[PDB]
Amino acid sequence: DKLNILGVGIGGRGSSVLRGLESQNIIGLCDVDWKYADHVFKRYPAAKKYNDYRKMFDEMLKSADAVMVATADHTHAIIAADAMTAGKHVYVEKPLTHTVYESRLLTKLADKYKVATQMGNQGASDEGVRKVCEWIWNGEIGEVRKVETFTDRPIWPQGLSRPEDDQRIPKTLNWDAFIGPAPYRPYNAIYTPWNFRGWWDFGTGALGDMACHILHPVFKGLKLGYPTKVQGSSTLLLNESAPMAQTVKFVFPARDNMPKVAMPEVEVYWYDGGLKPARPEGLPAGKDLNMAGGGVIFYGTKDTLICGCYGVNPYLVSGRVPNAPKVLREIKESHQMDWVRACKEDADDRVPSASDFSEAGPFNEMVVMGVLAVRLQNLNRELLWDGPNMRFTNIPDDATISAVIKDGFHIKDGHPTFDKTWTDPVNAQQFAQELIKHTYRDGWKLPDMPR
Amino acid sequence: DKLNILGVGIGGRGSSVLRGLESQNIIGLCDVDWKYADHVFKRYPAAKKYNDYRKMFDEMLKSADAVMVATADHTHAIIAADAMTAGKHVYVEKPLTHTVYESRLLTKLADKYKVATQMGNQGASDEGVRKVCEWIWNGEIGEVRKVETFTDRPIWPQGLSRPEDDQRIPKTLNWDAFIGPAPYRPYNAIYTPWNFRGWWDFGTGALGDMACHILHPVFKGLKLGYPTKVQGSSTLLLNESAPMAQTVKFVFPARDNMPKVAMPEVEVYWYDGGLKPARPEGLPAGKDLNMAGGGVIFYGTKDTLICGCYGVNPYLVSGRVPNAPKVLREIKESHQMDWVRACKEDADDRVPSASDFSEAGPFNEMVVMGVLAVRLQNLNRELLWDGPNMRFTNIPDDATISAVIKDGFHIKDGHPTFDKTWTDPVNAQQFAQELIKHTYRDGWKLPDMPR
């Protein structure tokens, strides 16, 4: 007796996800690009097709139990939020949302409406993260105070300028439903499909593409919540496009200790774009820190624990392979079909799936927080974050922010010229508020925060 | 009595340097590009002009006392080396050489021939580095075990492909004398004037352009020598062009202690291309780490000492202005005219200038060693360096190296493609030997290492 699922954003990842769900009932499909997406729609010949989720939701929500969402980052929130208010379970690809306010909105709506929820970081349903947690929690490495994490991404070009040409909107593409709540701009294929990753207003760069896969063991294993301090630096930082390489450093406060391991204040370093943490003491020359596209090094007082992306293949530098007590549930079905199971339990008995918004909500808040760190970098200050009120506490009321628009380097009869164009300065406090909570384009509205 | 000076590489920096020496006698000028450099030649209308340093040296060495060198990096060594074997003092812009072997060659030749020498890092003759040394040496910050250094450079584009079109050699440009001992290639104006910085075979990137200015306080003040370990990582690493941004980590061994401060094993971090060290504890929010294009943070057991590029404006995080005994020679003449003075002293009474190759020789070896770190990065290992024999000790003979030639990312009706083209693998041990000591193109010969 099957879940009725609507899909929204089916052309890319959404394709393989709907594959997971096929046992069920795909009854409605909604993509904005009927060309990129065609292959999928006619894999599900029985599903009424749409190209604006709001027409689909009007007609078809009354016939649906769940909603899968694999759109570009900046619309996940508003789609998911409209579905939960309607009583509907939602799978939502990672990253969960584009902003911090949105992540917190979703966490609070999941709670309020009592609906199965799942972020699309599927390495949360794998074995490797269960072994990292069961080991740290049995004190196998001791107290953890410094963590280093990295990806090799971006592997596409970032550092892009807004295209200066024109291009007409294809007949197959609903360019307005794509912009959604973001600020409107002239269409170009540099923005979709796929390449939205490197654009501030749509994607979250390497952070959004890879950090939810890489940092999930660090967040669950150290039972992290809100950080207290964050700082970032990067290669040339532009106003519309993410940079080629960034370093971010977070600091989290001490948490309750556990019986076999203490949970002190921990510093979490993130590197990407080629940049790597320096090699741990004890690690063999020649062992690659990258496994499946990234690495984590937990520096512990008694030993050093290393894993790959998706938490794969954890090992201790010393050579010891612990045999710690089993504590986390072993997920037997897939990452998607576990979410399905959760949808069919009554709210009162429901065993949440591995990426329920209760965990992934706050987790995404840390990933997306790294964006704020990198863009506010010119403030030249550890940024102090108050988590419960979603604001920095330590930005002066008269400091300002300016980004580079375009680099103008050129040589001129041998002598060089370092021209550059910069945006108009805005108030740093308002800049920041707006990265944390976006002002939605007219005709686009989130549901209210509860509580 | 006046110094007879030849100049070699006069168009760019060489211009302002010849300005310093004007009090003397500029009798010979040799540039390869008679167009870029015309302005200079006719500032010194009496100087026999050449475009190949070896013709000039034949005709005019027997008439010269000294030789100024401000060519592109990769020829400094061979020019300087031929001058010193002839009994001639040399000023040589920074970086001193392109390779480590060359730096060691020059240090040993200065010693053997007893000639005044000066590297062109003029911040060595300035005040701020005397204050950093007099303070460290008087225990004002205590023992230093961790140093962080950075520049905002490169401020020009690197990450370049060999140009695919052709241009003809102007009549004004002796493109062969330019290549010198480097491997020959078709001419293009992407290679000179000025822009050679971004090309492995000619320049050393941001390292060569800024690190001798930034790291000179760290080397002199901690009385460093050979490091024992290095490692590096970077953005996209190409086979002919330096990258957008790099991080290097050096480790030096403990040195003799001084009366008032101990000299333990110290780690030196280097960042560039926008990447910055995390902010020190104690430092005011808002205060910029960059001063005159870079920053140095000496982390001490009792206090934190910060300076800018060229060692400018050293301050302690605490707020104290120490008042340490004066120890280093206070340079009253200019950076160039001090070297001149040194040339006119008899060898046995010569007070060396502030950048005599006895110091700058080893100093450059560390700067240029950061290149080796970045290019050997794929070996996935802390590299152990044996200084006295100029080789790594921990590169396997089985292992090989491959660089990216050009990135082929493109999207194609929405579906993306991650092509990249790679060089043919070469033996890693021989690759490295050759970066340390280049094999000179036939017809180009360094002097022997002295016995």
Ligand SMILES: NC(=O)c1ccc[n+]([C@@H]2O[C@H](COP(=O)([O-])OP(=O)(O)OC[C@H]3O[C@@H](n4cnc5c(N)ncnc54)[C@H](O)[C@@H]3O)[C@@H](O)[C@H]2O)c1
């Ligand atoms: N879990 C993983 O392994 C994983 C892998 C890849 C992508 N993702 C995530 O999944 C999401 C999709 O990325 P992708 O590479 O598949 O993108 P894509 O652009 O390749 O495909 C997304 C599809 O959504 C459609 N779409 C976009 N905006 C829409 C909107 N507003 N309304 C309706 N349809 C819309 C697009 O036209 C396209 O067909 C992102 O959040 C991404 O980071 C997760």
Ligand SMILES: NC(=O)c1ccc[n+]([C@@H]2O[C@H](COP(=O)([O-])OP(=O)(O)OC[C@H]3O[C@@H](n4cnc5c(N)ncnc54)[C@H](O)[C@@H]3O)[C@@H](O)[C@H]2O)c1
């Ligand atoms: N001390 C500093 O502040 C500083 C400043 C600028 C440059 N530099 C250094 O000085 C050097 C030159 O830099 P630049 O910006 O003047 O370069 P440039 O390319 O602008 O000028 C170099 C000049 O030398 C000529 N030349 C090049 N190769 C030659 C060769 N083999 N023989 C003879 N002439 C040759 C060139 O045509 C040009 O006339 C580099 O080593 C660079 O790092 C140091």
Ligand SMILES: OC[C@H]1O[C@H](O[C@H]2O[C@H](CO)[C@@H](O)[C@H](O)[C@H]2O)[C@H](O)[C@@H](O)[C@@H]1O
């Ligand atoms: O009227 C309450 C809700 O009814 C539907 O959902 C219920 O039944 C679904 C079928 O199993 C379950 O998936 C769901 O958990 C139940 O609450 C509908 O999904 C909701 O939108 C209504 O709010």
Ligand SMILES: OC[C@H]1O[C@H](O[C@H]2O[C@H](CO)[C@@H](O)[C@H](O)[C@H]2O)[C@H](O)[C@@H](O)[C@@H]1O
């Ligand atoms: O997280 C705790 C500390 O971890 C590091 O140090 C521990 O582990 C090292 C090897 O991984 C050992 O050198 C050392 O003995 C341990 O203390 C790190 O050195 C510290 O900065 C962390 O606080």
Ligand SMILES: OC[C@H]1O[C@H](O[C@H]2O[C@H](CO)[C@@H](O)[C@H](O)[C@H]2O)[C@H](O)[C@@H](O)[C@@H]1O
């Ligand atoms: O960087 C873009 C994507 O990288 C990862 O995806 C690739 O690697 C996975 C591991 O083999 C494959 O399953 C996947 O099919 C590949 O494209 C990452 O998992 C994605 O989320 C990124 O978008």
Ligand SMILES: OC[C@H]1O[C@H](O[C@H]2O[C@H](CO)[C@@H](O)[C@H](O)[C@H]2O)[C@H](O)[C@@H](O)[C@@H]1O
């Ligand atoms: O925490 C201070 C230590 O710094 C070095 O090592 C720590 O951090 C390194 C990463 O840059 C790791 O390689 C190392 O395992 C960490 O403990 C250094 O090894 C030590 O002298 C310091 O204790």
Ligand SMILES: OC[C@H]1O[C@H](O[C@H]2O[C@H](CO)[C@@H](O)[C@H](O)[C@H]2O)[C@H](O)[C@@H](O)[C@@H]1O
């Ligand atoms: O990401 C949202 C927008 O960010 C940039 O714009 C802000 O920053 C400018 C100065 O750095 C201000 O002039 C402007 O008011 C801000 O909105 C970017 O330039 C925009 O295009 C983005 O949409």
Ligand SMILES: OC[C@H]1O[C@H](O[C@H]2O[C@H](CO)[C@@H](O)[C@H](O)[C@H]2O)[C@H](O)[C@@H](O)[C@@H]1O
């Ligand atoms: O792209 C739409 C608007 O963006 C900027 O404004 C947003 O963010 C501001 C802070 O930088 C807020 O003051 C404002 O509420 C937001 O709309 C820009 O300043 C506006 O001029 C644009 O319309």
Ligand SMILES: OC[C@H]1O[C@H](O[C@H]2O[C@H](CO)[C@@H](O)[C@H](O)[C@H]2O)[C@H](O)[C@@H](O)[C@@H]1O
């Ligand atoms: O005739 C012997 C040397 O002649 C030159 O050197 C002398 O004259 C110069 C005047 O200051 C100085 O370079 C040098 O210190 C003197 O030795 C020539 O430079 C050398 O090659 C000869 O040994």
Ligand SMILES: OC[C@H]1O[C@H](O[C@H]2O[C@H](CO)[C@@H](O)[C@H](O)[C@H]2O)[C@H](O)[C@@H](O)[C@@H]1O
């Ligand atoms: O140079 C050796 C150590 O330097 C630092 O330690 C001192 O400086 C810190 C602030 O810059 C102090 O807070 C710290 O407590 C001092 O001991 C550095 O923090 C250490 O990592 C180095 O071992």
Ligand SMILES: OC[C@H]1O[C@H](O[C@H]2O[C@H](CO)[C@@H](O)[C@H](O)[C@H]2O)[C@H](O)[C@@H](O)[C@@H]1O
């Ligand atoms: O990276 C460009 C160059 O930066 C420095 O030089 C600039 O700034 C100096 C003082 O700020 C001036 O003397 C000089 O005229 C400027 O070009 C640095 O000295 C150079 O080596 C760099 O190449």
Ligand SMILES: OC[C@H]1O[C@H](O[C@H]2O[C@H](CO)[C@@H](O)[C@H](O)[C@H]2O)[C@H](O)[C@@H](O)[C@@H]1O
């Ligand atoms: O050395 C272990 C310390 O880790 C941090 O230490 C360094 O980095 C800080 C910020 O990036 C600096 O302020 C500090 O001076 C460095 O030692 C941190 O200071 C502490 O939690 C640890 O002692």
Ligand SMILES: OC[C@H]1O[C@H](O[C@H]2O[C@H](CO)[C@@H](O)[C@H](O)[C@H]2O)[C@H](O)[C@@H](O)[C@@H]1O
């Ligand atoms: O000095 C740099 C030169 O080396 C690079 O190529 C070397 O390494 C290649 C693989 O990365 C080998 O195939 C080759 O034998 C080596 O010379 C670079 O590719 C060249 O541009 C430079 O001449």
Ligand SMILES: OC[C@H]1O[C@H](O[C@H]2O[C@H](CO)[C@@H](O)[C@H](O)[C@H]2O)[C@H](O)[C@@H](O)[C@@H]1O
């Ligand atoms: O264009 C550069 C010339 O040298 C290259 O070879 C050097 O590096 C090799 C290892 O990568 C050494 O084995 C070799 O002896 C060196 O000369 C290149 O392989 C040659 O084709 C070029 O002539």
